[PDB]
């Protein structure tokens, strides 16, 4: 079956971030300080931080 | 002297003047066109004066002239509500038809101008005579001038086109003639006043219906009998193609108001399902084919077959709304159809020499004014509101529906299908790319002459579509005389 050695399960098994690739030095810019997991969600709810302080002040 | 005879004799003076100036003074061919143009405008002036003296609520024919010189055949002219708007439309269209062909006719200009002036007198006599034998005499008198006009000034297939129109019209008419003759034998005359108070036997009405309907079905034209129109509307010069689609087609619609509704009441009522079958079949078949037509002229010509079916069904509605909308539709159609033939046969054809839609694309990039008018003209052909086409379409469809629902339903698919081919043709010519790459030579936009005859035509279809009361007002009282029926509590009052 599949004279060409392509197996979907091993295609799926190779679906991750590779340990070594010939291309990190050009692709690494995407996973950086500007686009870190933290800095990207730093402002996912823009005004939420300020409103919480203001709401607490109104309650008191 | 009657103003109605003034209508008939003015174009004959133009024929006399055009043929005689050469003797009076190498006259420039520009003078004959100025004589021919001035003649048609003087005729429009008399028609506008007749319409301003016209009475919208009189049952007696108006502008008649005493004769007291009874011969075997005499010409009696009269005008009532139904016939006046057909008279005005011939007078409005004829100057535009001449200006449309101002530069395109290059040889035989006397011949071209003399035939058009003769056709104006003959076409106007049809709506003006007061006799059914007189009606036929002028309905069939246009055949020789139309035969010669197509062969002298037509395109490559002109000989076949000129043979098709004469033979179909001659054949269908000979069936109408046999019916008109049978009536004259029974009543002793065909003068309208005498013949209108005749009540034929029903079996006679049936055989009178056929023959008359055979004739009008060939001249409507209905699908399956329409091969002559596609050959003759396309091969005809633009001016004659305008007259054939704006005035000639409307003689059979007006002929129902004189030859079928007032004297064949029972037959029309009983045979309505045949007419509505042919009409609904015509709407469907005439619409699918004009989707596939690749000649731009043949496509505009054959959409007329689709609109002619709609007001043919509205003229058999036995409904005051359907009958009036049928006249409005036939009146509006003669405006939009005239403009579309100018756009295709006059503007595209004169610039490219070809009628194939394959070679045209994206003309909006080069011709902004052409796309402006050609879009309003396609909206009118599609029956969009603020256009008299919509009002005629809408009213004759209500009458068709109220008479036979299922036939009116099938006829009411032209809202979809007429828009289907009017915008498909528009988006292939004006839109659908940058500019056709078969144009190795950039075009010029609309000239002043091209702009004015189009602007006039879209003006009539729009003002009359915003205020259709201009036509509907003088049409109400006289069409009341062509309905057949009574109410259970509004009849035989004492």
């Amino acid at each position: 079956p599949n004279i060409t050695g392509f197996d979907m399960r091993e295609f799926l098994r190779h679906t991750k971030t590779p340990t070594y690739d010939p291309w990190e030095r050009h692709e690494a810019w995407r996973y950086t300080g500007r686009f870190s997991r933290f800095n990207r969600f730093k402002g996912a709810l823009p005004g939420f931080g300020i409103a919480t302080v203001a709401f607490t002040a109104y309650c008191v | 002297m009657s103003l109605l005879y003034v209508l008939l004799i003015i174009p004959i003076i133009g024929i006399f003047l055009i043929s005689t100036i050469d003797s009076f003074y190498f006259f420039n061919v520009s003078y004959y066109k100025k004589i021919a143009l001035i003649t048609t405008i003087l005729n429009l002036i008399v028609s506008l004066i007749i319409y301003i003296l016209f009475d919208f609520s009189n049952n007696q024919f108006q502008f008649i002239q005493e004769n007291l010189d009874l011969s075997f055949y005499d010409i009696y002219l009269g005008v009532d509500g139904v016939s006046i708007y057909f008279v005005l439309l011939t007078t409005i269209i004829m100057p535009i038809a001449l200006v449309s062909n101002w530069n395109s006719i290059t040889n035989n200009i006397k011949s071209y101008l003399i035939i058009m002036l003769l056709l104006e007198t003959l076409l106007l006599a049809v709506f003006l005579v007061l006799d059914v034998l007189l009606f036929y005499i002028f309905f069939e008198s246009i055949l020789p001038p139309l035969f010669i006009l197509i062969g002298l000034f037509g395109s490559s297939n002109k000989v076949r086109a000129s043979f098709y129109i004469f033979l179909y019209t001659l054949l269908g008419s000979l069936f109408l003639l046999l019916s008109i003759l049978t009536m004259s034998s029974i009543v002793g005359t065909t003068y309208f006043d005498v013949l209108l108070k005749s009540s034929f036997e029903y079996t006679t009405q049936l055989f009178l219906f056929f023959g008359i309907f055979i004739a009008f079905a060939v001249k409507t034209p209905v699908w399956g009998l329409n091969s002559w129109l596609l050959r003759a509307h396309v091969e005809s010069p633009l001016g004659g193609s305008i007259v054939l689609a704006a005035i000639v087609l409307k003689l059979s619609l007006y002929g129902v108001f004189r030859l079928i509704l007032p004297i064949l009441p029972q037959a029309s009522l009983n045979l309505t399902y045949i007419v509505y079958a042919i009409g609904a079949i015509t709407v469907l078949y005439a619409s699918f084919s004009t989707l596939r037509t690749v000649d731009v002229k043949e496509l505009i010509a054959y959409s007329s077959v689709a609109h002619a079916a709609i007001y043919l069904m509205g003229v058999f509605s036995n409904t005051i709304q359907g009958l009036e909308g049928a006249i409005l539709l036939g009146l509006a159609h003669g405006f939009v159809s005239s403009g579309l033939f100018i756009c295709a046969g006059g503007i595209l054809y004169d610039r490219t020499g070809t009628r194939l839609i394959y070679f045209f694309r994206g003309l909006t990039q080069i011709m902004p004014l052409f796309s402006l008018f050609f879009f309003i003209l396609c909206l009118g052909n599609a029956g969009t509101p603020l256009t008299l086409n919509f009002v005629g379409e809408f009213m004759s469809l209500y009458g068709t529906l109220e008479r036979l629902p299922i036939a009116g339903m099938l006829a009411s698919t032209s809202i979809i299908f007429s828009a289907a081919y009017s915008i498909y043709m528009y988006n292939r010519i004006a839109f659908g790319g940058s500019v056709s790459l078969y144009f190795i030579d950039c075009f010029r936009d609309l000239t002043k002459r091209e702009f004015f005859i189009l602007f006039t035509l879209v003006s009539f279809t729009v003002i009359l579509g915003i205020y259709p009361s201009f036509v509907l007002d003088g049409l109400h009282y006289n069409i009341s005389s062509v309905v057949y029926g009574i109410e259970p509590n509004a009849s035989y009052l004492t």
Binding site: - | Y273, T352, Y358, L404, I440
Partner: protein, 73 residues
Amino acid sequence: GLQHYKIAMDPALVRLGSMISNRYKYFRWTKRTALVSFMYVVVVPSTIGYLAYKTDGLWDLRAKRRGDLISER
């Protein structure tokens, strides 16, 4: 008559148009064709006409209140 603009006349497109123009001369009465001609000239008009005959005068909406019927036949 008067000369027109220069058009890149496609030989294939002008022979398609000539074929379409001349197509009527080559039609024949074959097995499929008579079925097509019979279907659209006879059967479809006959069906449409027959249903018009069987529904003529059947319905009227004019001023039907609650308590009347659309049907009159």
